[PDB]
Design an enzyme around this catalytic site. Structure first.
Site, PDB file in Angstrom:
ATOM      1  N   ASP A 150       0.806  -1.220   0.000  1.00 51.90           N
ATOM      2  CA  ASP A 150       0.000   0.000   0.000  1.00 51.90           C
ATOM      3  C   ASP A 150       0.843   1.276   0.000  1.00 51.90           C
ATOM      4  O   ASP A 150       2.048   1.238   0.235  1.00 51.90           O
ATOM      5  CB  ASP A 150      -0.983   0.011   1.170  1.00 51.90           C
ATOM      6  CG  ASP A 150      -0.353  -0.450   2.459  1.00 51.90           C
ATOM      7  OD1 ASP A 150       0.454  -1.401   2.416  1.00 51.90           O
ATOM      8  OD2 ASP A 150      -0.673   0.132   3.515  1.00 51.90           O
TER       9      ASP A 150
HETATM   10  C1  LIG Z   1       4.229  13.989  17.184  1.00 50.99           C
HETATM   11  C2  LIG Z   1       3.065  13.799  16.216  1.00 50.99           C
HETATM   12  C3  LIG Z   1       1.821  14.662  16.508  1.00 50.99           C
HETATM   13  C4  LIG Z   1       0.469  13.927  16.341  1.00 50.99           C
HETATM   14  C5  LIG Z   1      -0.156  14.003  14.920  1.00 50.99           C
HETATM   15  C6  LIG Z   1      -1.700  13.827  14.840  1.00 50.99           C
HETATM   16  C7  LIG Z   1      -2.246  13.230  13.506  1.00 50.99           C
HETATM   17  C8  LIG Z   1      -3.629  12.507  13.588  1.00 50.99           C
HETATM   18  C9  LIG Z   1      -3.593  10.983  13.943  1.00 50.99           C
HETATM   19  C10 LIG Z   1      -4.603  10.092  13.159  1.00 50.99           C
HETATM   20  C11 LIG Z   1      -4.556  10.200  11.612  1.00 50.99           C
HETATM   21  C12 LIG Z   1      -5.908  10.434  10.922  1.00 50.99           C
HETATM   22  O1  LIG Z   1      -6.803  11.018  11.474  1.00 50.99           O
HETATM   23  S1  LIG Z   1      -6.149   9.795   9.203  1.00 50.99           S
HETATM   24  C13 LIG Z   1      -6.939  11.040   8.029  1.00 50.99           C
HETATM   25  C14 LIG Z   1      -8.485  10.977   8.021  1.00 50.99           C
HETATM   26  N1  LIG Z   1      -9.118  10.593   6.742  1.00 50.99           N
HETATM   27  C15 LIG Z   1      -8.790   9.472   5.968  1.00 50.99           C
HETATM   28  O2  LIG Z   1      -7.896   8.722   6.360  1.00 50.99           O
HETATM   29  C16 LIG Z   1      -9.555   9.221   4.665  1.00 50.99           C
HETATM   30  C17 LIG Z   1      -9.330   7.851   3.963  1.00 50.99           C
HETATM   31  N2  LIG Z   1      -7.986   7.736   3.381  1.00 50.99           N
HETATM   32  C18 LIG Z   1      -7.722   7.025   2.198  1.00 50.99           C
HETATM   33  O3  LIG Z   1      -8.694   6.499   1.669  1.00 50.99           O
HETATM   34  C19 LIG Z   1      -6.272   6.936   1.608  1.00 50.99           C
HETATM   35  O4  LIG Z   1      -6.307   5.841   0.759  1.00 50.99           O
HETATM   36  C20 LIG Z   1      -5.147   6.716   2.665  1.00 50.99           C
HETATM   37  C21 LIG Z   1      -5.736   6.324   4.011  1.00 50.99           C
HETATM   38  C22 LIG Z   1      -4.384   8.020   2.779  1.00 50.99           C
HETATM   39  C23 LIG Z   1      -4.127   5.553   2.220  1.00 50.99           C
HETATM   40  O5  LIG Z   1      -3.846   5.624   0.924  1.00 50.99           O
HETATM   41  P1  LIG Z   1      -2.784   4.358   0.105  1.00 50.99           P
HETATM   42  O6  LIG Z   1      -2.924   3.229   1.096  1.00 50.99           O
HETATM   43  O7  LIG Z   1      -3.508   4.216  -1.205  1.00 50.99           O
HETATM   44  O8  LIG Z   1      -1.419   5.005   0.049  1.00 50.99           O
END
Ligand SMILES: CCCCCCCCCCCC(=O)SCCNC(=O)CCNC(=O)[C@H](O)C(C)(C)COP(=O)(O)O
Ligand SMILES: CCCCCCCCCCCCCCCCCC(=O)OC[C@H](COP(=O)([O-])OCC(O)COP(=O)([O-])OC[C@@H](COC(=O)CCCCCCCCCCCCCCCCC)OC(=O)CCCCCCCCCCCCCCCCC)OC(=O)CCCCCCCCCCCCCCCCC
Ligand SMILES: CCCCCCCCCCCCCCCCC[C@@H](O)O[C@H](CO[C@H](O)CCCCCCCCCCCCCCC)COP(=O)(O)OCC[N+](C)(C)C
Ligand SMILES: CCCCCCCC/C=C\CCCCCCCC(=O)O[C@H](COC(=O)CCCCCCC/C=C/CCCCCCCC)COP(=O)(O)OCCN
Lengths: 98, 67, 124, 178, 88, 55, 80, 459, 128, 56
Positions: E43
């Site tokens: 992925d």
């Molecule tokens: C020290 C660090 C500080 C903390 C940072 C905080 C960050 C937030 C933590 C949680 C992360 C989120 O919310 S996650 C963001 C919220 N929305 C989504 O995930 C929508 C669905 N994504 C997809 O469909 C894509 O395919 C994808 C998943 C990109 C993969 O793609 P490949 O597989 O085709 O590469």
């Protein structure tokens, strides 16, 4: 996602050209074609400078008054002067608290 | 001297560098021990601190509250 | 620290002020005080070129120490007895100043106490 | 820095960049490798939790909240590679990079040394001179009448052709020029 | 003196070493020209970790626009050689 | 790439290493007294620097 | 020069804190796919390391031996 | 004194009777020899001036100015012969004639005994300068610049003439020796106030004083290289020399009439120094640094103390040399890239290593690094100002801080960073340019060992 | 959920916290494509002269010419005396002069009245 | 004359000699840094003598 075929092809040609150029930046064996004591350091860098400075200070700088002024030498009880031969009296019969 | 990269292993060491490092650490510790054995007063002091409460009222010229 | 706490937190009128001190005469309680003796003359100290701060009743021992350091120059570990004597004399001077501080403190705590007790018999 | 930029970044690109940035800052916070591995696996799980969300409004909202989380939780002193834009060796060797056209101004006594190098340079200059019109022609034919939409350049499509606008890419000074 | 004159074979060896140390990809199947998606079924998120591992291995940072495209070990080797001016 | 077996590095560091150990005692015992020493301290005030450093 | 890479099959997370990470992540339903890549940081001469106080007393033993022998020699030689 | 004037006059027929390809050689050699002869005037007395005749005299204030004036002509000829290559023979000779006439007028101006003769020569210096600017300047603004140069000066000096012939009608003479010996106080009256203004504003416009300094960023920028060199090095110092000469008659009126000018100078120092921080034109930055430096000379002359006069003389000489060198340094880059924008050509230290050293030394002298005479003059003026009022240290201190900022900025923009990629016509430095820089900088450093030669009559 | 970051003049809002990059219309995408096209044509026009073998000299940049001309020669023709312009000119140009005149005149009046009554201790003040 | 003044002045004076050789055919040689380091070491050794005089 990834290189397009034209992108990859252009990258390949540029990479070959760059590698050939970097190979061409290399020098031949002849390439730089140029055209046609034991303690000497301590006398030309120490003895000679200290000769000029000593001559300069002794016979020129000290010709003028007050040019080289020295802190008066400390005198202690019991010292003997080299000028008048005077002897400094001792220090007044210590309490001898021992 | 010629030591080569080793790629995820502990590097190659020579005998002179280790004996020099150990010798100088031992020299520092011997110096500390020697100076403490000879010059303890530089750290633990040489004279005691007098307690003012231990001084009598006559040592300091104090009258008995009636004059 | 205690002396700082007793002044800044307790009653400051019960303890001496380091700036305005002494406030009592040197013969207020003592019957006969002999004047403090000095060994080194003014000329000796001047000849020695000692620092003004250094010219304290302990000056003769410092003069001896300086002379000993100069006489045995290469051996910079020979002037131990002289340095010890000078340090002992300065320690004695410091405990004398501590004695003066304590004397002023107890005189000052006796004085206001005796006046307030004289006022204590004057209520009626 | 070698690929042409696009008009915008897609949602997938944004979330991937956020993943890499958050992992790097997490590694900055977790100095030790085992602790970094632990919390990086936890981070990957947190990212995978919504891997296949199909509500683009929900996905955008989740990405936005993730950005707000990162900005509050970022390391104020993140680790930077020494030659990266914020690093301690970023542009350290730029004072040593000298353009090749300077070699044209060398005194003939200077060029008397290195005869082979300058013969090779003359061959390179002749090659650059001989292929310029073909490259210009290729660019004009390939590009649209309005102009080029993107900064991407085409490769050489004939045999004895060089890719257009190649000289300054090929004759880069070096990364350690001296 | 300083670091040795790193060569093309060394870059390839280190890239394949790092890849073979990845639990997701088996050592026997992996090849220099293997696509990370078609060949290994990996992925986009997984790909990012490989790029970061390559950065940690060679000690330099690859920009995100440049990084996404690299899908084969040969591509990574060519990118690193282009950056470090490696011609053999 | 770790390598510290260059004589220039070792000698240059060692020369300052010897100073860092012995220069204080050598210099302190050869300068004339330029002040009045603090011969009288409370014990808790003599050891305060070491105490706070260890803390 | 003229050297090659050690075998990649020797880097096992066994006995190292990477095992602990693996167990803690297994107790959570996940896996750590990069552990072996870090294994070399715990394998060879890097397997064991000194503590802070041991680093501070790096040459205490030899210096102490020299100090005690010097004191023993001079204390008895001082009795002339 | 004719032993300098007459050889200078012979430079005209020599130039006009020279071969088409020998004018530069002959002019350079013989102007250098005239400088050698001019060095003899530095032998000054401690009590009175060198009174050659009824017409010409030399003092410890005018001798260094004369030496700088004669020394500047060979440097101007060296700096001019590059951009005048394609010129016809007769126009080259006309340009050299303009320079020779300018030198002749300046030499007589600095040594005239009588104030009306001084005025006539000090005004005659306008014609060659204006012709140079408006005939050999490069851009269309050079015409407007000329007008600004012409009418700012004259509007100041026309009252001065009216004052001078007035003074001779009441005191009987305009001879400077008689004026100094028979001096009388100025009463506190409206007529005396306007006579004071008429005697001062002409010199204030030449300095120039902040507020009437607009002509300078135009004239210096649009002028050719020799024009800007002579405008900065010598023509600005005419106001300082004239103010120093004419102040004797002014007292005690100067104590209260100097306040507006002291305020204008002490604030415009900050104003122009800060203007240099945001200047896209390099030659314009160099021009504004001159206003910032001459504000200090104005302050020193107004406060009227021996330390201030010594400092003003030293600063005038040092600024002449440094500003001439900076204008030449900018011209070297202009003749390469044909633009005066400072950020157009960058990273030049990589491509021109020794000219970068020249740039560094010029910038160091511009920010008055000790023990350069720039610093000597500046520090003397600052000490005298502190005596005049302690609060001045705040303004003076601020100016020093700003001057270092725009100097090194000028150095960092043009020499450091990375060279712009497109430019590829940056040729190696010529021997002519390197020697032109050396002949600016070496006398400056040499004057540190004998500063009494440039400290004026108050030493 | 977290302490919110608010932008300022000298510490601006980051791109990842900007709500504009999260509410995208088709018109926004069209504008971004147009911007890319403008940048791209300029890049191609620059690179054609840059890579040219024949060209010797400095490539003239009209944007730099416009910047310098606007910063110097276009200012007075576009000036109008307005109450804001008049007030700012009067304040910023006149106020400092009288402020400093008042300060220096007050200080010197104090100093002169002290000299007059013979209380300044000007001893050893030989040089001025 | 006592050697104190001469030695103190010579200590600073000899440090300027490698600067006067900055246009000589040692500055274009790879032995210039060692030359400068040797000059500074000799200057240190020379400056050790006035310090001894003061301690005495
Ligand atoms: C020290 C660090 C500080 C903390 C940072 C905080 C960050 C937030 C933590 C949680 C992360 C989120 O919310 S996650 C963001 C919220 N929305 C989504 O995930 C929508 C669905 N994504 C997809 O469909 C894509 O395919 C994808 C998943 C990109 C993969 O793609 P490949 O597989 O085709 O590469
Ligand atoms: C204290 C020093 C002792 C000196 C001993 C005697 C030396 C005499 C030298 C006199 C100056 C020469 C004239 C300057 C132009 C040089 C021409 C040139 O291009 O040379 C290239 C030549 C060949 O090199 P290259 O490889 O071709 O160069 C390629 C690039 O250009 C690359 O070149 P680069 O990167 O090498 O650049 C050249 C180099 C050097 O270039 C220069 O900077 C020359 C100008 C120096 C700064 C002057 C302007 C600042 C205002 C102060 C002015 C002071 C004047 C003093 C009187 C001078 C009289 C001549 O740059 C620097 O080193 C930094 C300069 C900043 C100096 C900072 C210190 C300033 C204060 C120093 C104290 C001054 C008073 C001393 C007395 C105090 C009480 C004892 O290089 C040399 O030969 C060395 C240059 C000389 C360096 C001397 C630095 C100290 C000068 C102090 C002033 C003179 C004092 C003399 C009496 C004793 C003191
Ligand atoms: C931007 C650059 C321009 C150049 C700057 C030149 C500055 C010129 C300023 C001249 C300095 C002082 C001039 C006259 C001295 C005092 C002026 C007046 O303000 O003070 C009072 C003068 O009294 C009244 O105020 C009369 C003056 C009022 C009418 C004049 C208008 C001034 C307004 C400012 C105009 C702007 C000047 C520049 C024009 C372009 C003093 O009180 P008083 O005791 O009674 O008079 C004593 C003077 N005596 C001895 C001759 C009799
Ligand atoms: C670049 C701009 C520079 C501007 C410079 C212009 C200002 C020059 C100063 C005034 C010039 C005229 C002064 C006249 C010469 C003085 C000679 C003199 O002493 O005559 C006075 C007379 O003084 C005058 O008449 C002068 C009055 C003004 C006449 C012209 C007005 C000019 C404008 C005045 C204000 C501007 C001055 C300052 C402006 C600074 C520049 C902005 C007294 O003589 P008596 O009549 O015999 O008196 C004694 C017996 N009864």
């Amino acid at each position: 996602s990834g290189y397009t075929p034209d992108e990859k092809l252009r990258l390949q040609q540029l990479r070959e050209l760059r590698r050939r150029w970097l190979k061409d930046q290399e020098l031949s064996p002849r390439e730089p074609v140029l055209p046609p004591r034991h303690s000497i350091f301590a006398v030309t860098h120490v003895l000679i400078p200290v000769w000029i400075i000593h001559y300069y200070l002794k016979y020129h700088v000290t010709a003028k008054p007050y040019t080289v002024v020295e802190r008066k030498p400390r005198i202690f009880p019991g010292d003997t002067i080299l000028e008048t031969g005077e002897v400094i009296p001792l220090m007044k019969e210590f309490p001898d608290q021992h | 001297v010629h030591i080569e990269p080793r790629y995820r292993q502990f590097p190659q060491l020579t005998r002179s560098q280790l004996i020099q490092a150990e010798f100088f650490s031992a020299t520092m510790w011997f110096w500390i021990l020697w100076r403490f054995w000879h010059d303890s007063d530089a750290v633990l002091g040489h004279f005691p601190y007098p307690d003012p409460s231990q001084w009598t009222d006559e040592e300091l010229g104090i009258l008995p509250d009636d004059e | 620290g205690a002396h700082l706490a007793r002044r800044y937190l307790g009653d400051a009128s019960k303890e001496p002020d380091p700036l305005r001190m002494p406030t009592f005469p040197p013969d207020y309680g003592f019957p006969e005080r002999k004047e403090r003796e000095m060994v080194a003359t003014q000329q000796e100290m001047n000849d020695a070129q000692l620092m003004l701060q250094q010219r304290d009743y302990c000056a003769h021992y410092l003069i001896q120490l300086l002379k000993c350091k100069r006489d045995s120059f290469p051996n910079f570990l020979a002037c131990k007895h002289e340095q010890h004597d000078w340090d002992y004399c300065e320690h004695l001077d410091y405990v004398k100043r501590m004695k003066e501080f304590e004397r002023e403190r107890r005189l000052l705590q006796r004085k206001k106490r005796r006046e307030q007790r004289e006022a204590e018999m004057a209520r009626g | 820095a070698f690929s042409a930029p696009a008009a915008y970044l897609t949602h997938q690109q944004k979330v991937l960049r956020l993943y890499k940035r958050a992992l790097r800052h997490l590694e900055s916070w977790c100095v030790h490798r085992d602790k970094y591995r632990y919390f990086a696996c936890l981070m990957r799980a947190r990212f995978d939790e919504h891997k296949n969300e199909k509500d683009m409004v929900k996905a955008t909202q989740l990405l936005r909240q993730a950005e707000e989380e990162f900005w509050y939780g970022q390391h104020p002193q993140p680790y930077i590679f020494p030659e990266s834009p914020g690093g301690t060796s970023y542009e350290r060797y730029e004072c040593y990079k000298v353009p090749e056209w300077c070699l044209d101004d060398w005194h003939p006594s200077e060029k008397a040394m290195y005869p082979d190098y300058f013969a090779k340079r003359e061959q390179w200059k002749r090659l650059r001179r001989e292929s310029w019109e073909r490259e210009v022609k290729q660019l004009q034919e390939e590009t649209p009448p309005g102009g080029p939409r993107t900064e991407a350049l085409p490769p050489a499509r004939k045999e004895g052709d060089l890719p257009p606008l190649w000289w300054h890419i090929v004759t880069r000074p070096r990364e350690r020029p001296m | 003196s300083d670091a040795p004159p790193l060569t093309l074979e060394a870059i390839k060896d280190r890239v394949l070493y790092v890849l073979k140390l990845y639990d997701k990809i088996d050592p026997e199947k992996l090849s220099v020209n293997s696509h990370f998606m078609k060949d290994l079924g990996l992925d986009s998120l997984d790909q990012v970790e490989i790029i970061m591992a390559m950065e940690d291995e060679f000690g330099f940072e690859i920009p995100d626009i440049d990084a996404e495209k690299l899908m084969c070990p040969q591509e990574i080797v060519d990118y690193i050689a282009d950056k470090k001016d490696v011609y053999e | 790439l770790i390598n510290e077996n260059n004589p220039l590095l070792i000698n240059s560091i060692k020369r300052l290493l010897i100073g860092s150990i012995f220069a204080g005692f050598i210099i302190s015992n050869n300068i004339p007294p330029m002040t009045v020493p603090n011969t009288t301290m409370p014990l808790y005030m003599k050891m305060t620097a070491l105490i706070v450093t260890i803390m | 020069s003229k050297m090659e890479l050690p075998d990649y099959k020797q880097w096992k997370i066994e006995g190292t804190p990477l095992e602990t990470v693996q167990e803690k992540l297994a107790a959570r339903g996940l896996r750590d796919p990069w552990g072996r890549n870090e294994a070399w940081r715990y394998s060879g001469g890097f397997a064991n390391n000194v503590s802070f106080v041991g680093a501070l007393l790096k040459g205490f033993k030899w210096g102490f031996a020299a100090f005690v022998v010097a004191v023993g020699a001079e204390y008895y030689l001082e009795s002339q | 004194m004719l032993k300098i004037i007459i050889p200078t006059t012979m430079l005209l027929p020599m130039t006009w009777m020279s071969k088409h390809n020998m004018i530069w050689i002959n002019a350079t050699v013989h102007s250098l020899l005239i400088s050698l002869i001019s060095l003899s005037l530095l032998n000054q007395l401690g009590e009175n001036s060198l009174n050659f005749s009824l017409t010409f005299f030399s003092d410890s204030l005018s001798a260094p100015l004369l030496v700088l004036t004669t020394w500047l002509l060979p440097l101007m000829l060296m700096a001019s012969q590059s951009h005048l290559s394609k010129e016809t023979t007769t126009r080259k000779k006309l340009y050299i004639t303009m320079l020779i006439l300018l030198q002749l007028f300046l030499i007589m101006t600095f040594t005239a005994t009588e104030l009306i003769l001084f005025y006539i020569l000090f005004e005659a210096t306008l014609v060659p300068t204006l012709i140079i600017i408006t005939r050999w300047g490069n851009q269309t603004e050079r015409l407007n610049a000329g007008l600004y140069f012409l009418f700012y000066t004259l509007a100041g000096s026309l009252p001065l003439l009216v004052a001078l012939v007035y003074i001779q009608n009441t005191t009987g003479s305009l001879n400077f020796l008689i004026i100094h010996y028979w001096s009388h106080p100025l009463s506190n009256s409206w007529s005396n106030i306007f006579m004071w203004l008429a005697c001062i504003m002409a010199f204030m416009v030449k300095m120039p004083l902040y507020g009437l300094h607009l002509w300078l960023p135009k004239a210096h920028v649009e002028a050719p290289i020799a024009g800007s060199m002579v405008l900065a090095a010598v023509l600005l110092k005419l106001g300082g020399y004239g103010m120093m000469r004419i102040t004797t008659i002014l007292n005690p009126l100067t104590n209260y009439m100097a306040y507006p000018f002291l305020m204008l100078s002490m604030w415009g120092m900050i104003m122009t120094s800060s203007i240099c921080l945001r200047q896209t034109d390099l030659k314009s930055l160099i021009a504004y640094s001159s206003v910032s430096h001459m504000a200090l000379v104005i302050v020193a002359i107004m406060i009227q103390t021996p330390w201030s006069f010594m400092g003003a003389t030293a600063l005038m000489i040092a600024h002449g040399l440094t500003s001439s060198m900076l204008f030449c340094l900018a011209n070297t880059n202009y003749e390469r890239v044909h633009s005066r924008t400072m950020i157009l050509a960058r990273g030049l230290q990589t491509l021109l290593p020794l000219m970068a050293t020249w740039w560094l030394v010029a910038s160091l002298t511009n920010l008055a690094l000790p023990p350069s005479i720039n610093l000597i003059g500046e520090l003397f003026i600052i000490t005298a100002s502190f005596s005049w009022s302690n609060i001045t240290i705040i303004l003076m201190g601020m100016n020093m801080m700003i001057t270092a900022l725009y100097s090194l900025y000028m150095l960092i923009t043009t020499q450091r960073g990375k060279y712009t990629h497109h430019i590829n016509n940056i040729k190696p430095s010529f021997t002519r340019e390197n020697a032109l820089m050396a002949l600016h900088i070496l006398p400056l450093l040499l004057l540190t060992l004998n500063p009494k030669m440039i400290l004026g009559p108050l030493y | 959920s977290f302490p919110k970051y608010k932008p300022s003049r000298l510490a601006t809002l980051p791109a990842t916290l900007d709500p504009a990059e999260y509410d995208i219309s088709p018109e926004t995408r069209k504008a971004q494509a147009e911007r890319l096209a403008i940048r791209s044509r300029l890049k191609r026009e620059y690179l054609l002269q840059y890579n040219d073998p024949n060209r010797l000299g400095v490539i003239e940049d009209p944007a730099l010419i416009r910047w310098t001309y606007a910063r110097s020669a276009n200012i007075y023709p576009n000036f109008r005396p307005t109450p804001k312009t008049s007030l700012l000119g009067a304040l910023f140009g006149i106020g400092p002069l009288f402020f400093w005149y008042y300060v220096f005149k007050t200080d010197r009046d104090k100093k002169e009245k002290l000299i007059q009554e013979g209380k300044l201790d000007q001893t050893f003040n030989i040089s001025y | 004359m006592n050697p104190f003044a001469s030695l103190t002045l010579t200590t600073l004076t000899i440090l300027t000699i490698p600067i006067m050789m900055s246009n000589s055919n040692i500055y274009k040689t790879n032995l210039y840094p060692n030359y400068v380091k040797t000059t500074v070491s000799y200057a240190f050794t020379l400056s050790l003598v006035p310090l001894l005089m003061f301690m005495h």
